[PDB]
Every structure is written in C-alpha cells, then in structure tokens.
Amino acid sequence: SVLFVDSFDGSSVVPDTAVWKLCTYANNAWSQWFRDVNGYENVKVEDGYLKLRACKDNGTYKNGGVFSKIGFPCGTRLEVKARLTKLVRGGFPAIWQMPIGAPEWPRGGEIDLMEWVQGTPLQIYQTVHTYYINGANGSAGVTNKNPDKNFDVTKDHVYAVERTEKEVIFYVDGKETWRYGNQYLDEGKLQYPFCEYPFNIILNFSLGGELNGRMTWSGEICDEDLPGEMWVDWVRVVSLN
Template sequence: MRPLILLACTALSAIASEDYKLVWSDEFDKAGPPDPAKWGFEKGMLRNNEKQFYTDRIRNARVEDGKLVIEAHKEVMEGGSFTSASLNSRGHGEWTCGRFEVKAKIPAARGTWPAIWMLPTDIGKVAWPKCGEIDIMEHVGYDPDIIHGTLHTEAYNHIKHTQRGEKINVPTATTEFHIYSAEWTPERIIISIDGKAYGTFEKKQSDTVDQWPFDKPFYLILNLAIGGDWGGQKGIDDAAFPQRMEVDYVRVYQQQKK
C-alpha cells in the first residue's frame, strides 16, 4: 500500500498555477475495480434519507475506457430501492489546502444527486457540521443546468439554512465533461468550473472553528446518490436507470515551499 499523503498548507497570497505541484492523482488508466491503493468504499444506506444502498461491487464502480464509472441501478438491496457507489480517499490521500481538480460528466435523470466533496479525517471525533465540509460540486437531476459549490460549518450549514454556497448555470453539465475544482488556502476557498471561479469564501479575522474549520486534513469523496432530502424533492424517474457518473481524472496539487 502506498504511503499516506498528509501535507500541511502554507500561506498563499495569490492563486498561481506555477506555484503548485501535482502530489496525488488517479488517471483511471487500468480497467477493473478502482485502485485500492487510492480508493476505499462506503457501504450501506448512510445519510440524507437517500434511496440507494452503497456497494463495492464492480457493477456499481469500475474503471473502463480510461474513466471511473459510478453507476446506479434500480434494484432492491438491504432496504434500498437502488444501488450505487461512494468512493473516498480516506487513508490513501488526505490534505490540508491545495488545488483539487476532478474532470467528470454527471447524470441527467430526475432523482440523481452526484457529488464531488471533502470531509475531514477527524469526523469520527468532531461531529458534522462542526467538523466542516467542502462541496466542490453538487447537482440534482431535477435542476439539470445548475451546479452548486458549498461550504458547511457549525455556524453555516443547511440545517440552519445558513450554508455558504454559490451556484452557476452550466447548460452542458449533463452532456459534457467539465473540470470541477477547489482552491483551498489558509485564507479562502475558491470553487471553480473549467477554470472559472464562481464561489469565493473568505476567512475573516474574527472567525473561530465554528466559522472556519478548514485548517486540518480532508479527504475526497466521489458518489452518486439517488433521491434523498434534496435529490428526491421532485421524485425519481425510475425508468431512466441505470444512470452513471463518469470521472476522467482526479488530480491534487499543493503549493511548494520556495
């Protein structure tokens, strides 16, 4: 197993590509199951009243034709009415600050809820939302042209309806691959699509951990949920399945000390 990548951030006064070096990636160039040295699986029915049972089956997550495929099927399993997959880099890649890029194409069906996001390694000790959450990309199938980028903290979260988030209209969100990215520094987190920033979240001098818990290691999550509190608000088009989220690559860059 490859060593855990756990790197600390340093102050960054400006976003500049030349300051960054690739420190972790998956190009998905080997067909079969996702690389176990880079990805683990969540299993079961986990959150948000979603309707899928997450598995580690190749039917639900596999590498084919140079891409990671996360595929949801209409089938009953362990109390779920769908199956899908949720991959994460916990224990294989964890970072404090950096630039995170995921090139992906997302499904279009009503009821789908794909996401590219990050959680902290201390979530087992510090409960959500106090632990923090970085949503690089979320999409709900009933609103096909809209991409969301959001931060959740103790002070700012969707339970309180205070979450810090932005959205952008992307007419080709479900028909073309796009690069979803986050630039995370000690002072701010910038959410972008195809290099265009649409959400900038600044840390204030007065912020405590309740407002800004983003000073510790986080890991990446790629998942395709079905239904749930948000994705299922306008129902699920059962006849549209199977549905898939395809990922061309995942790349993590960090600023290098000079």
C-alpha cells in the same frame, strides 16, 4: 507541483484499493442507498474513467461511490474532470471533500466541488458547509449566490477548489466561480475550519428520493431513467507555488 493523481488508466478494473474505499450505509440522503451494495457492483474502471453507477437492482436502490483513505492539507487545489452519462430524475451525483478526524459533522467542515439536482437541471452547485453557517440540525450550506444556470453536466467539465488558511475558491472549467473567506473570528465559532484537518476526495452517484418518508433535495426518483453513471476521467491535487 502535483501532490496526488488518479487517471483511472491502471492495470485494474476497480479504483486502486491502496488509495480508494467504497462509500457505506448512513441514515442520511446521499448515504441511504449504500446499504446492500454488493461490493464494487456500482464502481468500475474501464477506458480510463472511474465509472460510478446508480441502478435499482430487484426492488432496492443502489448508489455508486468511493472516497480516499488519504487527505490533503490547505495550500492545495483539487481538480476532478467528470460528466454524467445522462440527466437522471432522482440522481444526486457529488464531487466533494470532507475532513478526516474532525469532530462530528458539520463542525470541522464540508466542501462540494459539484452536485446536481433534477429541480435545476441546467445548473450544478458548489457549496461550503460549517457549524457556524448551518447550525448542527441545519444543512443548507452557502452556494454560489450568482451561478451558471445554462450548464450541461453531461459534457465533461473540470470541477475544482483552492483551500488556503485564507479561503476556499471554487472553479469550473478553470474559471473562478466564487469564494468563501476565513474571517479570523474567535476560532470557537468554527466559522472557517477547513485547514484544521486534512480533506479527502469523495466521488459518488447516489439516488435521492424519500427518506424516512420525507422527500429529499434531489427529489423524486424516476425508474424509467435508471441506470445512470458519472464518469470521473481523472482526479488531481496540486500544491501551490
């Protein structure tokens, strides 16, 4: 019941400009190293994978990411099949959704199908962020309390979420990993906003490191290990029947 799908096996060498835009500078951890990325230099399509890359070109760090113009409502499931080429110390690869036309983050929500941090190398993080949860100034999220801690991010896996009016469910290789639930409170507390906007698709490989001279989460960057790609074999959204 297939709503949208990219298997990156097109005529073309870069993800279809109809659907996909490139991530851009922002004074936060993931977005920092977008500033000064010359066009599509960290993003290509090649034997059927979207290949997102992180390098340090001449002194200065470069992230590789795109996101969808288009969003999707509740009653969908998102599926992203991806590996990392290698564990990169300071890597910060991300498969996530984000709301289009939401009041300022986090109010309208954020959903993370996969993120990776050098600190817990044998584990990924499936995480949900709201206003209710974080604060505004907070950005901790709520991750699987009881996750998989012998995981190999460098094999292909299929990262995945369901959004219903009722709740957000995460999967990995098609096993449920855990869920966050609408509690149906005073809609004011913005406890569960994940259906009030459409949520998009954001694929990136960012470098972490220092930020305004305070170290971020993905921790210290090791140049030795650069570059590193994340390959998205494909991306699929499915209405539920």
